[PDB]
Amino acid sequence: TRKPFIICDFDGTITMNDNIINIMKTFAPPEWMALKDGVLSKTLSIKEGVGRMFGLLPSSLKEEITSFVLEDAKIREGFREFVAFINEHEIPFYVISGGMDFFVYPLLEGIVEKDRIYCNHASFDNDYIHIDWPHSCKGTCSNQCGCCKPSVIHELSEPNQYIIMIGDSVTDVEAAKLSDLCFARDYLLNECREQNLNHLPYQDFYEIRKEIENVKEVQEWLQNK
């Protein structure tokens, strides 16, 4: 049998909204939209665009931003029960995200351990917010992703695993192409349908857990116990 291996995005997938976007709408000058549009058009890399977006913001905003995000962000229904199911079955599980640990960590506290969280780091030691990118592109990726999901997936997975990707962003199509099944919303769902990637839509993680359990290859794997 083939062991399941699950990777899951954070902003817009685990949370209802894109926390980077909401930070920018709330604190950034209008120029942030031009940077966003450059990332969308592929004029700017993710790393370059996101870096420049956070670099609009004075580090003196640390606590207001942190406070804003933790009260703004809402976790999608069923997520806790889903991680409990992962744990119950000892399924490899990783959150791989372009977000910043100053909000990803507190939002996942008591649910996901830090060795399962691959995200970027925002520093507040300079005049303007600075990003460190500890999981950047290696190997065959040279796309300046910032947090390189394909590179992390190749690093962590093993031969013959049944790779399940869960996401929402159109920029995670390369990760979805590596999956045997993609749970997709929003523009990622359109990309999976367009490129004929094996996929399923989802409203919440109750639905995700139910569907995962009844994937043939997952059932086979479980029924060795």
Q: What is the binding site for Zn ion (CB under 5 A)?
A: 137, 141, 143, 145, 148
Cα separation, 94 vs 91, whole angstroms: 10
| x-or-dash string of contact with Mg ion, 10-49, rule CB under 5 A | -xx-------------------------------------
Question: Are the beta carbons of 182 and 194 closer than 8 angstroms?
Answer: no
Residue 191 found at the interface with Mg ion (CB under 5 A): no
Q: For residue 204, what is the DSSP state?
A: S
Q: Which does 169 bind (CB under 5 to 8 A by kind): Zn ion, Mg ion, none?
A: Mg ion
The residue among 151 and 171 lying less far from Mg ion, judged by its C-beta, is 171
The counts of H helices and E strands in the chain are 11, 7
Name which of 9 and 191 has its Cβ closer to Mg ion: 9
Q: How far is the CB of 151 from Zn ion (least distance, A)?
A: 6
Closest alpha carbon to 7 in 137, 162, 211: 162
**Of 4, 9, 69, 162, the one binding Mg ion by CB under 5 A:** 9
Number of residues that bind Mg ion (CB under 5 A): 5
In the block, tokens 């996901």 appear at 112
- Whether the CB-CB separation of 176 and 182 falls below 8 Å is answered with yes
- Residue placing its CB nearer to Zn ion in the complex, 83 or 120: 120
Helix (H, G, I), strand (E, B) or coil at 90: coil
Beta carbon of residue 169, minimum distance to Mg ion (angstroms, whole number) = 4
